[PDB]
Write a protein that binds this DNA or RNA. Structure first.
Lengths: 176, 130, 62, 146, 170, 199, 100
RNA sequence: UCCACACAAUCCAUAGCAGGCUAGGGUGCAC
RNA sequence: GCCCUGAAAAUGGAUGGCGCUCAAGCGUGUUACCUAUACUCUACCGUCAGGGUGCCCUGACGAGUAGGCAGGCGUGGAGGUCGUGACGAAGCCAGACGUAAGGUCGGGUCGAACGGCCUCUAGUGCAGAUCUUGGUGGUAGUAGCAAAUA
RNA sequence: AGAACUGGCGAUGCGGGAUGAACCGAACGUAGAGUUAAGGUGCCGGAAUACACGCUCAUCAGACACCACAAAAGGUGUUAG
């Protein structure tokens, strides 16, 4: 002001603009590598089966998976591999959310949820092979070669994923 | 406010422009003095020698004379000196004088907390007595 | 590189607001002149300001 | 020879100035010569040259040749300042295009990428170096100065 | 204990002695303090009586310069050794002084070992003795202080106070 | 060998200076390298000029006055060891450790049955061949210098003799174990092989 | 013919983790921009990644310390790779261009 | 006194990720 | 051209070294790389252009002894102004910055005094001068304490 | 030794050249990223055991300038013209 030297005083919320240019990744990056986005599935191993949502790349390969366990629970990864091939659900992430928190129904919903995509998967597995499919899952990397098939398809599957990610969190404090 | 005190740390030279041939002789004072003669490598002003003081090393005008906390410190003689400081609050930190006695710090500490100017006055208080 | 460029930097500027002002009045009056000069057209007011700033060598007895 | 550089307004290395077509310049250029690579850059490379390296006039500091600044600003007594018009007009070297080539003042070039812009400093285009007049090579050279 | 250096121990537990401004070679005593550190009072007394007799050498780990060598190393093998009798005699005195404090406190004949011994050159006294060619060189004497604390604590405490790493994560 | 922990190298008819370049660089990589078959390495050029260079180095090794170094190394393992010290920065601690990581053994040291291996075109055959002012084996240089050599070739002859026996029976048993393809086979599968890679 | 051999070649340091309990040693994460072919990584692994330690610019410690990595294993398998460092790197040089 | 050894500081089910149970030749072992 | 021949020197071998010889030689062309504080760019400090409201902004230039000039730091004391003090000055470790001269506080010592600001003045800032004086280490547990033999 | 004309050193860092006031590149506030000069790419030592070819076999020889030597005579049926 005035006189007399001269401290502050605060501000913000501004900018600015982009828009056509908003967009360009936003589907996409998928386009370079193929595939859908997350939630992604154990075809293999075992025949009938299973679901997970890809919370993390620690880097690609080293990937974080989750579901629920506030108390006694159920497990969880950081893994460089073991088993996973993609489905047909896509979000507007690739693959970032995370911790290993969930909880309310999570295991079970994800279990009912899998049935459908897996049930869609096994005929296409019979149509191609099965024993062979393990070796694909084992990789993890991945991605280019063949991103296919159908499955049929999303709406509920997105809902679990969107929640899982939101779920993945927690705030509320705790000592244990 | 700003993240600009991250530049103050980052910029440096907190090389520490000491005397040098300081470490060899104890007498040689830790404080800097210019290398008068030619023959000094330092006077040639290369790196590895220690850099010389100039203005150009100087940090951004906004960052200067601030704590790493980013609050401006003003040394506070008494209860009175607080009165300007409470106006600042968030802007300023108060550093309470070495001169200050224990009993005087108490009044000053207690009043400061109500003002909402905690920085280094609680640290200094713990120190004197607790 | 250099030169004309080095020479310009090598100079100087230019006036200078006078060394010390014993008179308070002279310190504000000169500042008042740069003030008037700049908001309007007046060339004289800008000129007078420099001269008041220089010492025995600029200030004219008439 | 330095005082003639100062005359062309090549103040530092990787400085640039355009010159026109005449024997007199050349003869003055001959004293300059082992300072210099020179030649005609084509119609396009000059467009690429103005955009990155150009600057602002006196009565203002440096303000670039960038988009807004040429279209609205730049003084221009003779003719149209606008980006395409100005560039056409210098290249044709017609009336007061020598006043057009009273640019704001030097283009300050990047060092060449890849050193394809640097064939030997030692040599002339006749020795097999960089030095001397060369039309083709100057356009290649300027591209590298980007 | 005395007006002191670094005691770091306990009054109930320890016995004290110190010697003030004795004139003896500062290096020779330093050797002796170094050599007869951690040991009892009885072992040390025999060790020193042996020294005077030329039975036991005192190691000169530091302090060199045509010191006689391994007549026997005794403690370890090391070239340098003497058996400085005067310097030994003052420490015999110091140990006897401590041993009497220990006895008086009622600490046992069995009691423990010498935690701490130092040696400082205190002042160096002035003196001079004249030389040839009308020039002067000085011959001076070193007053020395030696500190002793003998402690209750060495065998026992080394177990009890068992005593230093630990953890991890609040 | 080209990995991270092997490292065993075949000296037979390899170029001394060339073997030493790669060997130094791998020791700088942090491997512990065992250079084998030391007498059999060759360094190109006529022996006479080669011996003249070494002879001066021996003549140098005649003094200083003092005792305690300098040195001229008689023998093929020793020659090669000298070669590394020159190849690697001898000033520094890093360089010094890299030097400690070499072992050079003549003939074969106590059994390394695992094969010693040739380096990417290191061998003197091709690397002579326009040609060959002569070419000199390290065993030929060192007979003239003196003998850690005399015992080493003596062992080489015994090692090669013993191993040469082994290799004949090894190979016999291998082609035998092997005749798998002397075709069987076809069995749809071979079509799979041709495809399998193919695509 | 070959194998690798060739220089192309850019990369990123993702981050270098100088980590123990005192148990664990030191890790370095590298992401080369596109490179090694999936095949070129896999038949191989042990490709040595050398970054020069130069002046960039202003005064960086411009030293005759040429740095060499090696790829330990992939983690990323088509892209990202694990590396470790052994030497001494210049000062907090995660970020910096990877290269031969 | 010290040798050898524990402990910790330096082709199938399919949970639900992962495994890893159990119905029905290749290679590690005190050799 | 090459090359040998001409071609001999003193403490020990080198072209910087190892020392390769269809080259790691040398010459002819040629491809790709590497590489400075350069050059470009990002951020920002001074000067000068200048602009604008004790303050903010644009762009250019910007190593430096002798040396000129200009702004600033610190000292003992005076006066006035703002105060500070029975745990002050002072000390040593540290803690925060100011490129920087310095600066501020804390540990835990200490047991009476001390800052700021303005204005002034001066027994006013040191590594050194075979500099002064005092103190202290290595030299050392070293030379000497030896020619009437008592 | 003593002039002229000029650049540098003095008073000019940094990069090259084994080291090295005045040789080359380069004129330097800070810090970073990029890319380059001079000059270099078997190892030390970035970076090629590069590509087309030709000579040389003495260890010539790894050298702009430099306390980098080598001549007259040059043989010569060495190779080439």
């Amino acid at each position: 002001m005035s006189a007399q030297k001269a401290p502050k005083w605060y501000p913000s919320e501004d900018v600015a603009a982009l828009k056509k240019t908003r967009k360009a990744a936003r589907p996409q990056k998928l386009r370079a590598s193929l595939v859908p986005g997350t939630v992604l599935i154990l075809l293999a191993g075992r025949f009938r089966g299973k679901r997970v949502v890809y919370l993390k790349h620690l880097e690609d390969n080293t990937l974080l998976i989750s579901g629920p366990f506030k108390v006694n629970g159920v497990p969880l990864r950081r893994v460089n591999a073991r088993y996973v091939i993609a489905t047909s659900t896509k979000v507007s992430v690739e693959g970032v959310n995370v911790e290993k928190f969930n909880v309310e129904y999570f295991a079970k919903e994800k279990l009912t949820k899998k049935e459908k995509k897996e049930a869609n998967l096994f005929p296409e597995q019979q149509n191609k092979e099965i024993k062979a499919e393990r070796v694909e899952d084992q990789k993890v990397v991945d991605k280019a070669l063949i991103a296919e098939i159908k499955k049929t398809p999303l709406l509920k599957q997105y809902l679990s994923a969107s929640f899982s990610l939101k779920n993945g969190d927690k705030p509320h404090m705790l000592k244990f | 406010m700003a993240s600009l005190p991250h530049p103050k740390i980052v910029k440096k030279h907190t090389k520490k422009f000491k005397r040098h041939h300081s470490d060899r002789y104890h007498r040689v004072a830790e404080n800097w003095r210019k290398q008068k003669g030619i023959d000094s490598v330092v006077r040639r002003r290369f790196r590895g020698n220690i850099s010389q003081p100039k203005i150009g090393y100087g940090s951004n005008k906004k960052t200067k004379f601030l704590s790493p906390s980013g609050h401006k410190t003003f040394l506070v003689a008494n209860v009175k000196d607080l009165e300007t400081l409470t106006m600042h609050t968030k802007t300023y930190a108060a550093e309470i004088a070495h001169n200050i006695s224990a009993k005087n710090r108490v009044v000053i500490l207690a009043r400061a907390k109500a003002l909402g100017i905690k920085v280094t006055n609680p640290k200094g208080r713990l120190a004197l007595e607790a | 590189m250099g030169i004309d460029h080095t020479s310009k930097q090598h100079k100087r500027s230019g006036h200078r607001t006078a060394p010390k002002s014993d008179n308070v009045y002279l310190k504000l009056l000169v500042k008042l002149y740069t003030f008037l000069a700049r908001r309007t057209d007046a060339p004289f007011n800008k000129v007078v300001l420099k001269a008041l700033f220089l010492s025995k060598i600029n200030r004219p007895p008439v | 020879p330095r005082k003639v550089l100062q005359l062309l307004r090549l103040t530092r290395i990787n400085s640039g100035t355009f010159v026109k077509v005449t024997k007199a310049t050349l003869e003055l250029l001959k004293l300059i010569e082992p300072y210099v690579a020179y030649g005609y850059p084509s119609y396009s490379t000059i467009r690429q040259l103005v955009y990155k390296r150009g600057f602002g006039k006196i009565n203002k500091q440096r303000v670039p040749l960038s988009d807004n600044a040429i279209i609205e600003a730049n003084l221009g007594k003779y003719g149209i300042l606008s980006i395409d018009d100005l560039i056409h007009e210098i290249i044709t070297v017609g009336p007061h295009f020598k006043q057009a080539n009273n640019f704001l003042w030097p283009f300050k070039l990047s060092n060449p990428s890849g050193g394809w812009g640097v064939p030997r400093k030692f040599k002339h285009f006749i020795q097999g170096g960089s030095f001397g007049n060369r039309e083709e090579f100057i356009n290649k050279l300027v591209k590298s100065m980007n | 204990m005395a007006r002191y250096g670094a005691t770091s121990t306990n009054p109930a537990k320890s016995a004290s002695a110190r010697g003030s401004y004795l004139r003896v070679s500062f290096k020779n005593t330093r050797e002796t303090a170094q050599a007869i550190n951690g040991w009892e009072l009885t072992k040390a007394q025999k060790y020193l009586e042996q020294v005077l007799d030329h039975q036991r050498a005192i190691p000169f780990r530091r302090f060199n310069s045509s010191i006689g060598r391994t007549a026997q190393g005794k403690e370890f093998g090391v070239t340098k050794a003497r058996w400085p009798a005067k310097s030994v005699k003052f420490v015999q005195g110091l140990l006897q002084n401590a041993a009497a404090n220990a006895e008086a406190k009622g600490l046992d004949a069995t009691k423990l070992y010498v935690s701490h011994i130092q040696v400082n050159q205190a002042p160096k006294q002035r003196r001079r003795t004249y030389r040839a060619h009308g020039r002067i060189n000085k011959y001076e004497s070193s007053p020395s202080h030696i500190e002793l604390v003998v402690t209750e604590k060495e065998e026992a405490v080394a177990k009890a106070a068992e005593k230093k790493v630990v953890r991890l994560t609040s | 060998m080209s990995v991270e922990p092997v490292v065993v190298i075949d000296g037979k008819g390899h170029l001394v200076g060339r073997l030493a370049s790669v060997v130094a660089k791998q020791l700088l990589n942090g491997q512990k390298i065992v250079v084998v078959r030391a007498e059999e390495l060759n360094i190109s050029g006529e022996f006479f000029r080669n011996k003249l260079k070494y002879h001066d180095f021996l003549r140098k090794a005649t003094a200083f006055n003092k005792t305690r170094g300098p040195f001229h190394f008689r023998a093929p393992s020793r020659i090669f060891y000298k070669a590394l010290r020159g190849m690697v920065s001898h000033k520094t601690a890093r360089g010094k450790a890299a030097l400690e990581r070499l072992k050079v053994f003549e003939g074969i040291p106590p059994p390394y049955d695992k094969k010693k291996r040739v380096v990417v075109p290191q061998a003197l055959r091709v690397l002579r061949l326009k040609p060959g002012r002569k070419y000199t084996t390290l065993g030929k240089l060192s007979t003239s210098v003196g003998w850690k050599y005399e015992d080493v070739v003596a062992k080489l002859e015994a090692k090669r003799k013993v191993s040469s026996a082994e290799y004949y029976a090894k190979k016999r048993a291998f082609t035998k174990k092997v005749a798998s393809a002397n075709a069987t086979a076809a069995e749809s599968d071979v079509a799979k092989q041709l495809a399998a890679l193919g695509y | 013919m070959a194998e690798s051999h060739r220089l192309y070649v850019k990369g990123k340091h993702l981050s270098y983790q100088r980590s123990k309990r005192v148990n664990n040693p030191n890790v370095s994460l590298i992401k080369i921009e596109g490179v090694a072919t999936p095949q070129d990584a896999q038949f191989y692994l042990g490709k040595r990644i050398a970054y020069v330690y130069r002046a960039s610019k202003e005064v960086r410690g411009s030293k005759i310390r040429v740095m060499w990595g090696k790829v330990t294993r992939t983690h990323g398998n088509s892209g990202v790779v694990r590396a470790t460092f052994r030497n001494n790197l210049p000062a907090k040089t995660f970020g910096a261009s990877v290269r031969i």
